[PDB]
Amino acid sequence: TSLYITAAPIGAVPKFLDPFEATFIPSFLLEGFFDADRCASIAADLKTDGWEVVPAGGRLLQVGHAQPIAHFPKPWLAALSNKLARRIVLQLTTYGWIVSEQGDLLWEHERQHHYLPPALIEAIEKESPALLKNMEEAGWIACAAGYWQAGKARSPYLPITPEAITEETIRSMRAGAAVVHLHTRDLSDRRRIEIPGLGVVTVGSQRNQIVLDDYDAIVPMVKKREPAAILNLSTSVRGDRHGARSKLRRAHLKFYDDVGSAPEVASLSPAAVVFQGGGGYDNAPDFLDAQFDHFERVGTRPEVEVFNHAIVDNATSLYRDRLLRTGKPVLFMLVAGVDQYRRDPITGEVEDDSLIARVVREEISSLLADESADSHRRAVELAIGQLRPVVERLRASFPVSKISILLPGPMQNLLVDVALGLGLDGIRVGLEDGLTVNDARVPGGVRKARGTWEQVSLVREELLGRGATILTAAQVRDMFGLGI
Numbered sequence: 001t002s003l004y005i006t007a008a009p010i011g012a013v014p015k016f017l018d019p020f021e022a023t024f025i026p027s028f029l030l031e032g033f034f035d036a037d038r039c040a041s042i043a044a045d046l047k048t049d050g051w052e053v054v055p056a057g058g059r060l061l062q063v064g065h066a067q068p069i070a071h072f073p074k075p076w077l078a079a080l081s082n083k084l085a086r087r088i089v090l091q092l093t094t095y096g097w098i099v100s101e102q103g104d105l106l107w108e109h110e111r112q113h114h115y116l117p118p119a120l121i122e123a124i125e126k127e128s129p130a131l132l133k134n135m136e137e138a139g140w141i142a143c144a145a146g147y148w149q150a151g152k153a154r155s156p157y158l159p160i161t162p163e164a165i166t167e168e169t170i171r172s173m174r175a176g177a178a179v180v181h182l183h184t185r186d187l188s189d190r191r192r193i194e195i196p197g198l199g200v201v202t203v204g205s206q207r208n209q210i211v212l213d214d215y216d217a218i219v220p221m222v223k224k225r226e227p228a229a230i231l232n233l234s235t236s237v238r239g240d241r242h243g244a245r246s247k248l249r250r251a252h253l254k255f256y257d258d259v260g261s262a263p264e265v266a267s268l269s270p271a272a273v274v275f276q277g278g279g280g281y282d283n284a285p286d287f288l289d290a291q292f293d294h295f296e297r298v299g300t301r302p303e304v305e306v307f308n309h310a311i312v313d314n315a316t317s318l319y320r321d322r323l324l325r326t327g328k329p330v331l332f333m334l335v336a337g338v339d340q341y342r343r344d345p346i347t348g349e350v351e352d353d354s355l356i357a358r359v360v361r362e363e364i365s366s367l368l369a370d371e372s373a374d375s376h377r378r379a380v381e382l383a384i385g386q387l388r389p390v391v392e393r394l395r396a397s398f399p400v401s402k403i404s405i406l407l408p409g410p411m412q413n414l415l416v417d418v419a420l421g422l423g424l425d426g427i428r429v430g431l432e433d434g435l436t437v438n439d440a441r442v443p444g445g446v447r448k449a450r451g452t453w454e455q456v457s458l459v460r461e462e463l464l465g466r467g468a469t470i471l472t473a474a475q476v477r478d479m480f481g482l483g484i
């Protein structure tokens with residue numbers, strides 16, 4: 001098959017981390033400078049924003065970062081188990097350190113306030129006391145108890161503003177992506193917390209939210225630079241119950257006068273999406289009737305986000321004629337590897353409804369953890385066996401269709417094999433789905449991606465190495481009849 005790459009640069013879940021902000025707040029400074037109650041308040045707000053309580057024993061590397069009241073050579077990391085090295089590499093690249101061509105970690109800035117937690121330091125101390133000593137000579141200093149910003153599910157490169165989203169969209173397209181799937185985030189709750197003997201920390205939910213003013217900016221800013229761009233707007237209200245039938249979910253799917261069209265594509269999920277991990281959202285029949293009516297009217301092609309088997313059942317039965325009406329080829333995205341529930345409306349009980357059955361998915365994760373060529377091949381087999389009948393049901397009901405696949409970060413080594421073996425038409429990558437890339441230069445072999453564009457370049461590379469063709473935006477538009 002020929003394939004198109006979808007870039008997904010933002011999503012609902014990951015958060016931006018400012019790597020130039022403090023990453024550790026000592027207890028004695030917070031508790032002993034504010035009243036015990038506003039100290040409980042600041043703490044709660046830090047905790048809301050993902051900061052975690054830590055005991056003494058951490059290490060802090062700090063330069064030019066306080067007011068009155070930086071390399072990691074490859075042989076250092078190579079001295080450790082793969083697991084320990086990966087932990088360090090992921091933590092430091094989350095903090096904006098980068099991997100050099102020699103496979104060293106480098107911080108390429110003057111100031112920094114970068115902290116490693118006691119559990120990491122303890123593990124280093126056990127595997128290599130000499131490394132801990134080398135680190136302390138390099139300036140890593142022992143810490144008291146306090147609060148740490150791990151940046152769990154965070155990236156210093158996540159774009160959350162119209163300007164940054166535009167720039168990443170364009171870079172992703174230039175790295176090879178034909179389609180860009182967009183979310184916006186609500187940043188109205190941003191607030192600066194000042195801490196004496198430390199400085200300012202900025203908190204905020206970065207909550208997933210359709211922001212109309214953001215799209216009013218993004219759509220023409222993208223189109224001015226790349227008029228061929230195929231924009232796929234998220235209609236999801238993930239994280240935000242109580243908005244599931246709101247017209248807000250199509251208000252961004254208007255004709256944009258500055259651009260002379262409605263968005264080319266937008267996401268549509270024709271059943272409730274109930275993540276096993278929590279945070280899902282309904283898509284009721286009355287709401288969906290309104291969505292389809294609207295997509296058809298403005299000329300936006302739905303991309304059916306196939307989260308679960310309920311969606312497969314519904315798309316191929318009740319909603320089939322409506323999907324045909326919104327134009328061929330009908331577009332599908334397999335949200336593979338993400339555990340899903342279906343809830344019985346009568347009893348309220350849930351059962352597995354994942355595309356890859358959770359029990360099978362758990363086996364796949366175990367196999368990928370082996371890091372052996374045999375295990376990888378078994379993992380691919382299990383994935384294909386689970387996904388094959390889903391793909392065939394979709395192909396049978398929609399002879400003129402295009403089916404892509406995504407996978408969560410930790411399963412992404414399967415992406416190309418699974419997509420090629422299923423005869424899929426596309427593959428999606430981006431910070432929405434995973435924050436990492438492989439990098440053979442660095443011990444442990446994994447690090448934070450420099451951007452969605454980097455993930456796009458790498459998947460494009462792997463595809464070309466197996467004799468696949470990569471379609472451009474101009475080609476996808478023409479062949480899928482989009483933007484009319």
Ligand SMILES: O=C([O-])CC(=O)C(=O)O
Pocket residue numbers: 011012233234235236237238267268269305
């Ligand atoms: O974009 C969509 O339609 C779905 C999505 O990102 C999510 O709910 O995780």
Ligand SMILES: [Mg+2]
Pocket residue numbers: 011012181182183234236267432
């Ligand atoms: Mg999305």
